[PDB]
Amino acid sequence: MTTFLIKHKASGKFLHPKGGSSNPANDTNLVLHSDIHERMYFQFDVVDERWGYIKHAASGKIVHPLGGKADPPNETKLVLHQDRHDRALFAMDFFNDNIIHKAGKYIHPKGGSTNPPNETLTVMHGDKHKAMEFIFVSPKDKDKRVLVYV
Amino acid sequence: MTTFLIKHKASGKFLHPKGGSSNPANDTNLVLHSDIHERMYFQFDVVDERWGYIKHAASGKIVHPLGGKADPPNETKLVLHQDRHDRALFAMDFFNDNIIHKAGKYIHPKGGSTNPPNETLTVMHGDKHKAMEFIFVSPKDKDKRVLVYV
Ligand SMILES: CC(=O)N[C@@H]1[C@@H](O)[C@@H](O)[C@@H](CO)O[C@@H]1O
Ligand SMILES: CC(=O)N[C@@H]1[C@@H](O)[C@@H](O)[C@@H](CO)O[C@@H]1O
Ligand SMILES: CC(=O)N[C@@H]1[C@@H](O)[C@@H](O)[C@@H](CO)O[C@@H]1O
Ligand SMILES: CC(=O)N[C@@H]1[C@@H](O)[C@@H](O)[C@@H](CO)O[C@@H]1O
Ligand SMILES: CC(=O)N[C@@H]1[C@@H](O)[C@@H](O)[C@@H](CO)O[C@@H]1O
Ligand SMILES: CC(=O)N[C@H]1[C@@H](O)[C@@H](O)[C@@H](CO)O[C@@H]1O
């Protein structure tokens, strides 16, 4: 099961549960932060071809739009939650370098900066540009891309 | 280990070894053809993250640029060959729906038609357009996409 870091391409910061817990509470926000440690490692659980659950490795909780909205509007915050259902399905587009939700919007840093400060929230947004690009890299070498689908 | 059909998206035809043999000779051309059977099933052997070998399931031979050059020119024919080496590396881009060789060109039907006739050759070409799109589908449901990387 590949373990990887979700690296914001423009800044080199990574996706974290806010606070960096090895067992974040349900609805903990997902933020960007420069630190690397085992509590910001992720896995991907395939459900249906490209679609699956982005899983926080330390806790097992997965990435949700807050409230579990089926078609989340722009600026809906991303959180971790233990529930599994179809409204938490994403795809890890390692060719265009983005993360897309089942209803078609992407994970962004809130406000869309190419250099978001530590603790910047992540949100859903439909726009496509350099500041929403992410790559999926080895915990052993933050420049080495790894295949999240195996 | 997923077995799949390589489906030309605009026409619905599939990638075949010319002649449909369970053991095509080395340098057998890869063509498009409407038929479905076990001698046009493929598998994908991952080598390095997105890069891997496109493997003819019945024979074990893989897709090569004819002549095995590292940086083949436009209109280089695609063939099957037993050899394994780094000039036979491709990625299966199931987000943009194409097949890309390590040096950057794509698999095309020769001449670029959206509805090529049976037996049309495939070739490498750098252009991107609707007639070089491919999707990767179940041998049991040719309209169901399947994940080729697992
Ligand atoms: C000291 C410590 O554990 N720090 C972590 C930090 O590494 C990062 O995970 C951050 C994300 O909100 O949360 C915590 O502050
Ligand atoms: C009952 C219900 O809708 N539960 C969901 C839960 O499954 C998860 O999606 C969460 C994310 O914030 O939002 C909701 O509370
Ligand atoms: C115009 C502008 O600044 N747009 C970006 C938008 O593209 C998206 O990244 C969003 C995420 O919160 O933040 C900004 O609004
Ligand atoms: C008998 C017959 O037509 N069978 C096959 C056909 O199914 C297809 O694989 C084709 C590819 O060139 O090769 C043969 O014509
Ligand atoms: C060693 C050798 O024969 N060289 C290559 C072979 O490995 C394969 O790439 C082939 C494809 O047409 O082209 C060449 O013949
Ligand atoms: C639709 C079209 O005009 N296609 C071009 C190239 O883009 C390429 O497809 C090539 C492959 O042989 O055939 C044509 O020259």
UniProtKB/Swiss-Prot annotation, chains A, B:
Keywords assigned: Glycoprotein, Hemagglutinin, Lectin
Sugar-modified residues: N26, N74, N118
Binding-site positions, D-galactose 3: E75, H108, G111, D127, K128, H129
GO molecular function annotations of the record: galactose binding
PTM notes: Glycosylated.
Temperature dependence: Optimum hemagglutination activity between 37 and 40 degrees Celsius. Retains its hemagglutination activity up to 60 degrees Celsius, but loses the activity at higher temperatures. This protein is stable at high temperatures over 80 degrees Celsius. The thermal stability is increased by the presence of ligand D-galactose.
Binding site for D-galactose 1: H16, G19, D35, I36, H37, E119
Binding-site residues for D-galactose 2, renumbered to this chain: D27, H64, G67, D83, R84, H85
Activity: how regulated: Hemagglutination activity is not dependent on divalent cations. Hemagglutination activity is highly inhibited by D-galactose and N-acetyl-D-galactosamine, and to a lesser extent by raffinose. Also inhibited by melibiose and alpha-lactose, but not by beta-lactose or D-glucose.
Keyword DNA damage: no
pH effect summary: Optimum hemagglutination activity at pH 7.4. Retains its hemagglutination activity throughout pH range 3-10. This protein is most stable at pH 7.4.
Quaternary state and interactors: Homodimer. Likely to form large oligomers; oligomerization enhances hemagglutination activity.
Function: D-galactose-binding lectin. Also binds N-acetyl-D-galactosamine. Has hemagglutination activity towards all types of human erythrocytes (O, A and B) and rabbit erythrocytes. Agglutinates Gram-negative and Gram-positive bacteria including E.coli DH5-alpha and L.plantarum ATCC8014, respectively, and has bacteriostatic activity against them. Also agglutinates M.lysodeikticus. May be involved in innate immunity by recognizing and eliminating pathogens.
Name the record gives this protein: Galactose-binding lectin
